[PDB]
Amino acid sequence: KQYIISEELISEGKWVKLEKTTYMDPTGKTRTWESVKRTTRKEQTADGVAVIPVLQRTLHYECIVLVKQFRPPMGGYCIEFPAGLIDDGETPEAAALRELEEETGYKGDIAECSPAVCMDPGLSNCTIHIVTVTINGDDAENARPKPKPGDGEFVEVISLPKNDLLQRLDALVAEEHLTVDARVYSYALALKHA
Amino acid sequence: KQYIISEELISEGKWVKLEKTTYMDPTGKTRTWESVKRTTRKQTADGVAVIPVLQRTLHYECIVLVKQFRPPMGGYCIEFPAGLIDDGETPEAAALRELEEETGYKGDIAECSPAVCMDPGLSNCTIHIVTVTINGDDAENARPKPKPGDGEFVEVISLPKNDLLQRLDALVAEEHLTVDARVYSYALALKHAN
Ligand SMILES: CC(C)N(C)c1ncnc2c1cnn2C
Ligand SMILES: CC(C)N(C)c1ncnc2c1cnn2C
Ligand SMILES: [Cl-]
Ligand SMILES: [Mg+2]
Ligand SMILES: [Mg+2]
Ligand SMILES: [Mg+2]
Ligand SMILES: [Mg+2]
């Protein structure tokens, strides 16, 4: 039933644009929406990746490796899956492994890769691949993980046991001002509900 | 260590605005970011998303999702039921209301997250994730009546919790839909649990 009639540009920055979207509703009435899009998406299957990094070590409970960063849109620190935009020509798996090493120091192994999933579909066209990666924490490569952050990237690594993820997140939120990402929270909640 | 210096309005629609954010990096170097915000925030958060666990005796437990045309995406998306919190609504109450409007199910609150971020690299948008049970054997939920607001056109898709990630992948394969990142992240963690 529904389709896009037109996309009018309102304002274009270096990274993000706003559009006036005109569409057909299922009654045959024409309507509008205000849409956010990134300016950086070329031939990539998605804007970005987020990495679910499962750190595995013998005689340790598995951990989910998270990162804490200052996020200017939010005006504060956020705890998220390691994540970044996919470079032109890069595969989602390659962007995931690259971002994970850059942000955390870990060299992971691909486990699975989602289709393009939407970040906030009521507002933006932004998509990511959610890529699950296992990190062999017994490998010497992963002993003293050294992050190699890019220009303007400032990251703290936080590894939390998978078996207690939601309580350990609540305990960090209780101790300082800091926002957990919706994807991390959704993942932690499902680990509880299962 | 990092903080916001100033925010310059670039462009303000009715629903969304685009700001140019100035901030201090950890080195004491001043930097800029392009930041999206909703204009509608009053609230604990902009919105709620509802994880609705449909429980019927002698049936698999289902997670209730919605499929809707999303103009920023130019297509159909599969999501948790969700909407903006009305000024002076609690998240709990917004959840049950949004669930009823979008699905017609009448639910009970199990738990409620703190405010979690949607896409903190781009926007300040936050939601409360609210886990709700639905006693699908109650007379009120027998023939549930979705009461949509203006400009909402919602198909309800109920999927078994125990096979959620495979069922979502099947839909995507056949139906050309985008699954929401929080739905996919929940579904993933249901598979990754112990
Ligand atoms: C359906 C009604 C209440 N309108 C048009 C909207 N509701 C929520 N977010 C919106 C719009 C339009 N643009 N954006 C970003
Ligand atoms: C060079 C990198 C770190 N910068 C500036 C950015 N990276 C990704 N998204 C961005 C920005 C700025 N605005 N927005 C929306
Ligand atoms: Cl539950
Ligand atoms: Mg990143
Ligand atoms: Mg990065
Ligand atoms: Mg909604
Ligand atoms: Mg609604």
PDB file of N, CA, C and O in Angstrom, chain A residues 101-170:
ATOM      1  N   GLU A 101      38.772  -4.052  16.907  1.00  0.00           N
ATOM      2  CA  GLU A 101      40.193  -3.912  17.255  1.00  0.00           C
ATOM      3  C   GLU A 101      40.563  -2.475  17.582  1.00  0.00           C
ATOM      4  O   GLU A 101      41.230  -2.216  18.578  1.00  0.00           O
ATOM      5  N   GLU A 102      40.096  -1.551  16.777  1.00  0.00           N
ATOM      6  CA  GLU A 102      40.351  -0.122  16.997  1.00  0.00           C
ATOM      7  C   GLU A 102      39.848   0.344  18.360  1.00  0.00           C
ATOM      8  O   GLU A 102      40.545   1.016  19.125  1.00  0.00           O
ATOM      9  N   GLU A 103      38.633  -0.059  18.688  1.00  0.00           N
ATOM     10  CA  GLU A 103      37.996   0.425  19.919  1.00  0.00           C
ATOM     11  C   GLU A 103      38.403  -0.294  21.201  1.00  0.00           C
ATOM     12  O   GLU A 103      38.413   0.346  22.266  1.00  0.00           O
ATOM     13  N   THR A 104      38.679  -1.586  21.127  1.00  0.00           N
ATOM     14  CA  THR A 104      38.935  -2.393  22.306  1.00  0.00           C
ATOM     15  C   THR A 104      40.301  -3.001  22.378  1.00  0.00           C
ATOM     16  O   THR A 104      40.706  -3.405  23.473  1.00  0.00           O
ATOM     17  N   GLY A 105      40.967  -3.154  21.254  1.00  0.00           N
ATOM     18  CA  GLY A 105      42.212  -3.932  21.214  1.00  0.00           C
ATOM     19  C   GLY A 105      42.044  -5.394  20.838  1.00  0.00           C
ATOM     20  O   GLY A 105      42.994  -6.051  20.467  1.00  0.00           O
ATOM     21  N   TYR A 106      40.844  -5.940  20.968  1.00  0.00           N
ATOM     22  CA  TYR A 106      40.669  -7.310  20.701  1.00  0.00           C
ATOM     23  C   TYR A 106      40.597  -7.636  19.216  1.00  0.00           C
ATOM     24  O   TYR A 106      40.027  -6.852  18.388  1.00  0.00           O
ATOM     25  N   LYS A 107      41.218  -8.795  18.915  1.00  0.00           N
ATOM     26  CA  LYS A 107      41.121  -9.436  17.648  1.00  0.00           C
ATOM     27  C   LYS A 107      40.137 -10.570  17.729  1.00  0.00           C
ATOM     28  O   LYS A 107      40.422 -11.665  18.306  1.00  0.00           O
ATOM     29  N   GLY A 108      38.973 -10.339  17.170  1.00  0.00           N
ATOM     30  CA  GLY A 108      37.910 -11.334  17.235  1.00  0.00           C
ATOM     31  C   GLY A 108      37.810 -12.242  16.027  1.00  0.00           C
ATOM     32  O   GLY A 108      38.552 -12.061  15.060  1.00  0.00           O
ATOM     33  N   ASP A 109      36.878 -13.197  16.078  1.00  0.00           N
ATOM     34  CA  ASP A 109      36.560 -14.140  14.954  1.00  0.00           C
ATOM     35  C   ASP A 109      35.078 -14.032  14.669  1.00  0.00           C
ATOM     36  O   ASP A 109      34.259 -13.999  15.619  1.00  0.00           O
ATOM     37  N   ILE A 110      34.688 -13.940  13.404  1.00  0.00           N
ATOM     38  CA  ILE A 110      33.294 -13.692  13.064  1.00  0.00           C
ATOM     39  C   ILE A 110      32.472 -14.928  13.476  1.00  0.00           C
ATOM     40  O   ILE A 110      32.946 -16.041  13.318  1.00  0.00           O
ATOM     41  N   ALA A 111      31.306 -14.725  14.073  1.00  0.00           N
ATOM     42  CA  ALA A 111      30.363 -15.840  14.327  1.00  0.00           C
ATOM     43  C   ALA A 111      29.189 -15.723  13.449  1.00  0.00           C
ATOM     44  O   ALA A 111      28.814 -16.731  12.874  1.00  0.00           O
ATOM     45  N   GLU A 112      28.547 -14.545  13.411  1.00  0.00           N
ATOM     46  CA  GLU A 112      27.354 -14.308  12.576  1.00  0.00           C
ATOM     47  C   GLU A 112      27.145 -12.827  12.279  1.00  0.00           C
ATOM     48  O   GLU A 112      27.723 -11.933  12.921  1.00  0.00           O
ATOM     49  N   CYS A 113      26.373 -12.577  11.247  1.00  0.00           N
ATOM     50  CA  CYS A 113      26.166 -11.210  10.756  1.00  0.00           C
ATOM     51  C   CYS A 113      24.744 -11.075  10.355  1.00  0.00           C
ATOM     52  O   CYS A 113      24.286 -11.852   9.509  1.00  0.00           O
ATOM     53  N   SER A 114      24.042 -10.130  10.983  1.00  0.00           N
ATOM     54  CA  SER A 114      22.644  -9.849  10.719  1.00  0.00           C
ATOM     55  C   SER A 114      22.414  -9.195   9.388  1.00  0.00           C
ATOM     56  O   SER A 114      23.313  -8.590   8.856  1.00  0.00           O
ATOM     57  N   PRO A 115      21.179  -9.280   8.870  1.00  0.00           N
ATOM     58  CA  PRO A 115      20.782  -8.264   7.846  1.00  0.00           C
ATOM     59  C   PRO A 115      20.841  -6.837   8.421  1.00  0.00           C
ATOM     60  O   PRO A 115      21.013  -6.643   9.673  1.00  0.00           O
ATOM     61  N   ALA A 116      20.801  -5.865   7.504  1.00  0.00           N
ATOM     62  CA  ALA A 116      20.605  -4.466   7.824  1.00  0.00           C
ATOM     63  C   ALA A 116      19.356  -4.320   8.695  1.00  0.00           C
ATOM     64  O   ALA A 116      18.274  -4.848   8.349  1.00  0.00           O
ATOM     65  N   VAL A 117      19.557  -3.761   9.905  1.00  0.00           N
ATOM     66  CA  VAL A 117      18.497  -3.453  10.878  1.00  0.00           C
ATOM     67  C   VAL A 117      18.455  -1.955  11.182  1.00  0.00           C
ATOM     68  O   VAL A 117      19.478  -1.287  11.107  1.00  0.00           O
ATOM     69  N   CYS A 118      17.282  -1.429  11.497  1.00  0.00           N
ATOM     70  CA  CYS A 118      17.043  -0.005  11.578  1.00  0.00           C
ATOM     71  C   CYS A 118      17.274   0.476  12.997  1.00  0.00           C
ATOM     72  O   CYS A 118      16.908  -0.187  13.982  1.00  0.00           O
ATOM     73  N   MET A 119      18.001   1.575  13.091  1.00  0.00           N
ATOM     74  CA  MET A 119      18.338   2.229  14.342  1.00  0.00           C
ATOM     75  C   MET A 119      17.162   2.968  15.021  1.00  0.00           C
ATOM     76  O   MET A 119      17.062   2.935  16.262  1.00  0.00           O
ATOM     77  N   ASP A 120      16.300   3.639  14.266  1.00  0.00           N
ATOM     78  CA  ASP A 120      15.271   4.515  14.864  1.00  0.00           C
ATOM     79  C   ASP A 120      14.341   4.908  13.703  1.00  0.00           C
ATOM     80  O   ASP A 120      14.376   6.021  13.226  1.00  0.00           O
ATOM     81  N   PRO A 121      13.488   3.953  13.252  1.00  0.00           N
ATOM     82  CA  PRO A 121      12.842   4.049  11.969  1.00  0.00           C
ATOM     83  C   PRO A 121      11.737   5.084  11.899  1.00  0.00           C
ATOM     84  O   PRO A 121      11.354   5.458  10.808  1.00  0.00           O
ATOM     85  N   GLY A 122      11.216   5.484  13.047  1.00  0.00           N
ATOM     86  CA  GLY A 122      10.320   6.593  13.156  1.00  0.00           C
ATOM     87  C   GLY A 122      10.922   7.955  12.897  1.00  0.00           C
ATOM     88  O   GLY A 122      10.173   8.939  12.781  1.00  0.00           O
ATOM     89  N   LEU A 123      12.248   8.021  12.817  1.00  0.00           N
ATOM     90  CA  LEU A 123      12.996   9.285  12.699  1.00  0.00           C
ATOM     91  C   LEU A 123      14.054   9.327  11.585  1.00  0.00           C
ATOM     92  O   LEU A 123      14.150  10.342  10.839  1.00  0.00           O
ATOM     93  N   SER A 124      14.810   8.236  11.416  1.00  0.00           N
ATOM     94  CA  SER A 124      15.938   8.173  10.493  1.00  0.00           C
ATOM     95  C   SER A 124      15.924   6.930   9.603  1.00  0.00           C
ATOM     96  O   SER A 124      15.255   5.931   9.908  1.00  0.00           O
ATOM     97  N   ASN A 125      16.654   6.983   8.515  1.00  0.00           N
ATOM     98  CA  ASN A 125      16.854   5.789   7.678  1.00  0.00           C
ATOM     99  C   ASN A 125      18.072   4.987   8.140  1.00  0.00           C
ATOM    100  O   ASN A 125      18.391   4.026   7.504  1.00  0.00           O
ATOM    101  N   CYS A 126      18.731   5.336   9.234  1.00  0.00           N
ATOM    102  CA  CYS A 126      19.990   4.716   9.596  1.00  0.00           C
ATOM    103  C   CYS A 126      19.842   3.242   9.885  1.00  0.00           C
ATOM    104  O   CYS A 126      18.909   2.820  10.537  1.00  0.00           O
ATOM    105  N   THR A 127      20.800   2.483   9.363  1.00  0.00           N
ATOM    106  CA  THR A 127      20.804   1.066   9.563  1.00  0.00           C
ATOM    107  C   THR A 127      22.196   0.647   9.965  1.00  0.00           C
ATOM    108  O   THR A 127      23.227   1.378   9.706  1.00  0.00           O
ATOM    109  N   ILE A 128      22.228  -0.527  10.593  1.00  0.00           N
ATOM    110  CA  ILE A 128      23.441  -1.234  10.873  1.00  0.00           C
ATOM    111  C   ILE A 128      23.352  -2.689  10.582  1.00  0.00           C
ATOM    112  O   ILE A 128      22.233  -3.221  10.455  1.00  0.00           O
ATOM    113  N   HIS A 129      24.521  -3.345  10.493  1.00  0.00           N
ATOM    114  CA  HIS A 129      24.617  -4.817  10.695  1.00  0.00           C
ATOM    115  C   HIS A 129      25.051  -5.070  12.101  1.00  0.00           C
ATOM    116  O   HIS A 129      25.994  -4.422  12.594  1.00  0.00           O
ATOM    117  N   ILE A 130      24.371  -5.998  12.764  1.00  0.00           N
ATOM    118  CA  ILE A 130      24.767  -6.394  14.074  1.00  0.00           C
ATOM    119  C   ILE A 130      25.601  -7.643  13.857  1.00  0.00           C
ATOM    120  O   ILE A 130      25.120  -8.700  13.350  1.00  0.00           O
ATOM    121  N   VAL A 131      26.857  -7.564  14.227  1.00  0.00           N
ATOM    122  CA  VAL A 131      27.799  -8.674  13.960  1.00  0.00           C
ATOM    123  C   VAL A 131      28.248  -9.287  15.239  1.00  0.00           C
ATOM    124  O   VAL A 131      28.837  -8.562  16.015  1.00  0.00           O
ATOM    125  N   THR A 132      28.046 -10.605  15.404  1.00  0.00           N
ATOM    126  CA  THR A 132      28.469 -11.363  16.572  1.00  0.00           C
ATOM    127  C   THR A 132      29.843 -11.906  16.285  1.00  0.00           C
ATOM    128  O   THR A 132      30.103 -12.485  15.214  1.00  0.00           O
ATOM    129  N   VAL A 133      30.753 -11.700  17.233  1.00  0.00           N
ATOM    130  CA  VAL A 133      32.129 -12.049  17.085  1.00  0.00           C
ATOM    131  C   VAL A 133      32.502 -12.691  18.425  1.00  0.00           C
ATOM    132  O   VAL A 133      32.068 -12.181  19.458  1.00  0.00           O
ATOM    133  N   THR A 134      33.279 -13.767  18.395  1.00  0.00           N
ATOM    134  CA  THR A 134      33.896 -14.377  19.579  1.00  0.00           C
ATOM    135  C   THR A 134      35.345 -13.944  19.630  1.00  0.00           C
ATOM    136  O   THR A 134      35.960 -13.791  18.607  1.00  0.00           O
ATOM    137  N   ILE A 135      35.838 -13.615  20.814  1.00  0.00           N
ATOM    138  CA  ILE A 135      37.187 -13.256  21.069  1.00  0.00           C
ATOM    139  C   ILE A 135      37.796 -14.405  21.918  1.00  0.00           C
ATOM    140  O   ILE A 135      37.289 -14.731  23.031  1.00  0.00           O
ATOM    141  N   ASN A 136      38.878 -15.004  21.395  1.00  0.00           N
ATOM    142  CA  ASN A 136      39.606 -16.032  22.114  1.00  0.00           C
ATOM    143  C   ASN A 136      40.551 -15.259  23.041  1.00  0.00           C
ATOM    144  O   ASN A 136      41.628 -14.813  22.630  1.00  0.00           O
ATOM    145  N   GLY A 137      40.113 -15.108  24.305  1.00  0.00           N
ATOM    146  CA  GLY A 137      40.883 -14.438  25.336  1.00  0.00           C
ATOM    147  C   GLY A 137      42.090 -15.247  25.832  1.00  0.00           C
ATOM    148  O   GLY A 137      42.968 -14.693  26.511  1.00  0.00           O
ATOM    149  N   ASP A 138      42.174 -16.526  25.467  1.00  0.00           N
ATOM    150  CA  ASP A 138      43.417 -17.316  25.737  1.00  0.00           C
ATOM    151  C   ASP A 138      44.513 -17.092  24.683  1.00  0.00           C
ATOM    152  O   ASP A 138      45.675 -17.405  24.929  1.00  0.00           O
ATOM    153  N   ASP A 139      44.156 -16.561  23.507  1.00  0.00           N
ATOM    154  CA  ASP A 139      45.183 -16.230  22.509  1.00  0.00           C
ATOM    155  C   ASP A 139      46.093 -15.102  23.027  1.00  0.00           C
ATOM    156  O   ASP A 139      45.622 -14.164  23.651  1.00  0.00           O
ATOM    157  N   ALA A 140      47.402 -15.197  22.774  1.00  0.00           N
ATOM    158  CA  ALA A 140      48.378 -14.162  23.190  1.00  0.00           C
ATOM    159  C   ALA A 140      48.118 -12.778  22.559  1.00  0.00           C
ATOM    160  O   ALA A 140      48.369 -11.734  23.190  1.00  0.00           O
ATOM    161  N   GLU A 141      47.584 -12.786  21.331  1.00  0.00           N
ATOM    162  CA  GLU A 141      47.081 -11.578  20.660  1.00  0.00           C
ATOM    163  C   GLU A 141      46.105 -10.765  21.537  1.00  0.00           C
ATOM    164  O   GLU A 141      46.060  -9.539  21.457  1.00  0.00           O
ATOM    165  N   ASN A 142      45.336 -11.461  22.377  1.00  0.00           N
ATOM    166  CA  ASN A 142      44.284 -10.858  23.153  1.00  0.00           C
ATOM    167  C   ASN A 142      44.594 -10.790  24.624  1.00  0.00           C
ATOM    168  O   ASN A 142      43.679 -10.763  25.430  1.00  0.00           O
ATOM    169  N   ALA A 143      45.876 -10.709  24.973  1.00  0.00           N
ATOM    170  CA  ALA A 143      46.298 -10.778  26.382  1.00  0.00           C
ATOM    171  C   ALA A 143      46.364  -9.372  26.925  1.00  0.00           C
ATOM    172  O   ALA A 143      45.732  -9.055  27.908  1.00  0.00           O
ATOM    173  N   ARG A 144      47.142  -8.542  26.253  1.00  0.00           N
ATOM    174  CA  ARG A 144      47.268  -7.134  26.559  1.00  0.00           C
ATOM    175  C   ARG A 144      46.619  -6.432  25.350  1.00  0.00           C
ATOM    176  O   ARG A 144      47.333  -6.011  24.418  1.00  0.00           O
ATOM    177  N   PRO A 145      45.267  -6.380  25.314  1.00  0.00           N
ATOM    178  CA  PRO A 145      44.625  -5.698  24.196  1.00  0.00           C
ATOM    179  C   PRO A 145      44.942  -4.201  24.258  1.00  0.00           C
ATOM    180  O   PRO A 145      44.645  -3.588  25.280  1.00  0.00           O
ATOM    181  N   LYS A 146      45.557  -3.653  23.197  1.00  0.00           N
ATOM    182  CA  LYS A 146      45.839  -2.219  23.073  1.00  0.00           C
ATOM    183  C   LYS A 146      44.862  -1.560  22.069  1.00  0.00           C
ATOM    184  O   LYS A 146      44.962  -1.819  20.902  1.00  0.00           O
ATOM    185  N   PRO A 147      43.911  -0.726  22.530  1.00  0.00           N
ATOM    186  CA  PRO A 147      43.072   0.013  21.565  1.00  0.00           C
ATOM    187  C   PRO A 147      43.845   0.939  20.646  1.00  0.00           C
ATOM    188  O   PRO A 147      44.787   1.586  21.097  1.00  0.00           O
ATOM    189  N   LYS A 148      43.446   1.000  19.381  1.00  0.00           N
ATOM    190  CA  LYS A 148      44.013   1.929  18.383  1.00  0.00           C
ATOM    191  C   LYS A 148      42.898   2.858  17.891  1.00  0.00           C
ATOM    192  O   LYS A 148      42.422   2.757  16.764  1.00  0.00           O
ATOM    193  N   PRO A 149      42.477   3.772  18.756  1.00  0.00           N
ATOM    194  CA  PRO A 149      41.376   4.650  18.377  1.00  0.00           C
ATOM    195  C   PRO A 149      41.782   5.643  17.264  1.00  0.00           C
ATOM    196  O   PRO A 149      42.957   6.013  17.168  1.00  0.00           O
ATOM    197  N   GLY A 150      40.819   6.014  16.415  1.00  0.00           N
ATOM    198  CA  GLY A 150      41.058   6.956  15.317  1.00  0.00           C
ATOM    199  C   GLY A 150      40.978   8.364  15.854  1.00  0.00           C
ATOM    200  O   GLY A 150      40.666   8.577  17.053  1.00  0.00           O
ATOM    201  N   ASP A 151      41.242   9.342  14.998  1.00  0.00           N
ATOM    202  CA  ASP A 151      41.187  10.755  15.436  1.00  0.00           C
ATOM    203  C   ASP A 151      39.796  11.132  16.033  1.00  0.00           C
ATOM    204  O   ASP A 151      38.750  10.925  15.392  1.00  0.00           O
ATOM    205  N   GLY A 152      39.805  11.672  17.246  1.00  0.00           N
ATOM    206  CA  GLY A 152      38.568  12.124  17.922  1.00  0.00           C
ATOM    207  C   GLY A 152      37.793  10.982  18.596  1.00  0.00           C
ATOM    208  O   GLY A 152      36.619  11.155  19.013  1.00  0.00           O
ATOM    209  N   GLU A 153      38.457   9.821  18.711  1.00  0.00           N
ATOM    210  CA  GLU A 153      37.865   8.650  19.331  1.00  0.00           C
ATOM    211  C   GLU A 153      38.543   8.466  20.640  1.00  0.00           C
ATOM    212  O   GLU A 153      39.762   8.440  20.695  1.00  0.00           O
ATOM    213  N   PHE A 154      37.730   8.324  21.681  1.00  0.00           N
ATOM    214  CA  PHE A 154      38.166   8.227  23.065  1.00  0.00           C
ATOM    215  C   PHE A 154      37.297   7.202  23.766  1.00  0.00           C
ATOM    216  O   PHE A 154      36.134   7.483  24.115  1.00  0.00           O
ATOM    217  N   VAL A 155      37.850   6.010  23.937  1.00  0.00           N
ATOM    218  CA  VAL A 155      37.069   4.881  24.355  1.00  0.00           C
ATOM    219  C   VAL A 155      37.581   4.191  25.610  1.00  0.00           C
ATOM    220  O   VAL A 155      38.762   3.861  25.692  1.00  0.00           O
ATOM    221  N   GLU A 156      36.662   3.876  26.524  1.00  0.00           N
ATOM    222  CA  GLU A 156      36.945   2.986  27.644  1.00  0.00           C
ATOM    223  C   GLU A 156      36.319   1.599  27.411  1.00  0.00           C
ATOM    224  O   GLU A 156      35.154   1.510  27.043  1.00  0.00           O
ATOM    225  N   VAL A 157      37.074   0.528  27.694  1.00  0.00           N
ATOM    226  CA  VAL A 157      36.575  -0.840  27.565  1.00  0.00           C
ATOM    227  C   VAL A 157      35.980  -1.362  28.869  1.00  0.00           C
ATOM    228  O   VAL A 157      36.555  -1.249  29.927  1.00  0.00           O
ATOM    229  N   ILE A 158      34.794  -1.931  28.794  1.00  0.00           N
ATOM    230  CA  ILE A 158      34.133  -2.441  29.963  1.00  0.00           C
ATOM    231  C   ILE A 158      33.652  -3.817  29.569  1.00  0.00           C
ATOM    232  O   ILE A 158      32.761  -3.940  28.735  1.00  0.00           O
ATOM    233  N   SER A 159      34.221  -4.829  30.178  1.00  0.00           N
ATOM    234  CA  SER A 159      33.789  -6.224  29.971  1.00  0.00           C
ATOM    235  C   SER A 159      32.937  -6.738  31.075  1.00  0.00           C
ATOM    236  O   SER A 159      33.392  -6.759  32.213  1.00  0.00           O
ATOM    237  N   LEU A 160      31.757  -7.253  30.784  1.00  0.00           N
ATOM    238  CA  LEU A 160      30.864  -7.694  31.864  1.00  0.00           C
ATOM    239  C   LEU A 160      30.411  -9.101  31.632  1.00  0.00           C
ATOM    240  O   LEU A 160      30.118  -9.463  30.493  1.00  0.00           O
ATOM    241  N   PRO A 161      30.282  -9.896  32.715  1.00  0.00           N
ATOM    242  CA  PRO A 161      29.828 -11.260  32.551  1.00  0.00           C
ATOM    243  C   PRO A 161      28.472 -11.360  31.949  1.00  0.00           C
ATOM    244  O   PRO A 161      27.517 -10.679  32.367  1.00  0.00           O
ATOM    245  N   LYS A 162      28.392 -12.179  30.938  1.00  0.00           N
ATOM    246  CA  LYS A 162      27.159 -12.429  30.263  1.00  0.00           C
ATOM    247  C   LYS A 162      26.055 -12.935  31.167  1.00  0.00           C
ATOM    248  O   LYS A 162      24.894 -12.559  30.968  1.00  0.00           O
ATOM    249  N   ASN A 163      26.444 -13.795  32.119  1.00  0.00           N
ATOM    250  CA  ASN A 163      25.531 -14.401  33.082  1.00  0.00           C
ATOM    251  C   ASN A 163      24.964 -13.412  34.105  1.00  0.00           C
ATOM    252  O   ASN A 163      24.103 -13.797  34.862  1.00  0.00           O
ATOM    253  N   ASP A 164      25.421 -12.177  34.120  1.00  0.00           N
ATOM    254  CA  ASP A 164      24.886 -11.154  35.056  1.00  0.00           C
ATOM    255  C   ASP A 164      24.792  -9.808  34.378  1.00  0.00           C
ATOM    256  O   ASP A 164      25.013  -8.796  35.030  1.00  0.00           O
ATOM    257  N   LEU A 165      24.585  -9.785  33.050  1.00  0.00           N
ATOM    258  CA  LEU A 165      24.795  -8.567  32.334  1.00  0.00           C
ATOM    259  C   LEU A 165      23.819  -7.397  32.789  1.00  0.00           C
ATOM    260  O   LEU A 165      24.247  -6.292  33.050  1.00  0.00           O
ATOM    261  N   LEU A 166      22.532  -7.656  32.850  1.00  0.00           N
ATOM    262  CA  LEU A 166      21.584  -6.665  33.191  1.00  0.00           C
ATOM    263  C   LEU A 166      21.878  -6.083  34.606  1.00  0.00           C
ATOM    264  O   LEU A 166      21.843  -4.882  34.763  1.00  0.00           O
ATOM    265  N   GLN A 167      22.233  -6.901  35.606  1.00  0.00           N
ATOM    266  CA  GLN A 167      22.472  -6.327  36.952  1.00  0.00           C
ATOM    267  C   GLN A 167      23.719  -5.531  36.964  1.00  0.00           C
ATOM    268  O   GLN A 167      23.829  -4.539  37.648  1.00  0.00           O
ATOM    269  N   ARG A 168      24.706  -5.944  36.178  1.00  0.00           N
ATOM    270  CA  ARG A 168      25.978  -5.235  36.139  1.00  0.00           C
ATOM    271  C   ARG A 168      25.892  -3.903  35.426  1.00  0.00           C
ATOM    272  O   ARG A 168      26.562  -2.922  35.818  1.00  0.00           O
ATOM    273  N   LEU A 169      25.072  -3.856  34.378  1.00  0.00           N
ATOM    274  CA  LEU A 169      24.659  -2.575  33.772  1.00  0.00           C
ATOM    275  C   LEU A 169      23.885  -1.640  34.765  1.00  0.00           C
ATOM    276  O   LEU A 169      24.156  -0.414  34.857  1.00  0.00           O
ATOM    277  N   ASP A 170      22.900  -2.200  35.442  1.00  0.00           N
ATOM    278  CA  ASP A 170      22.139  -1.394  36.477  1.00  0.00           C
ATOM    279  C   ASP A 170      23.120  -0.887  37.547  1.00  0.00           C
ATOM    280  O   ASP A 170      23.031   0.245  37.949  1.00  0.00           O
TER     281      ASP A 170
END
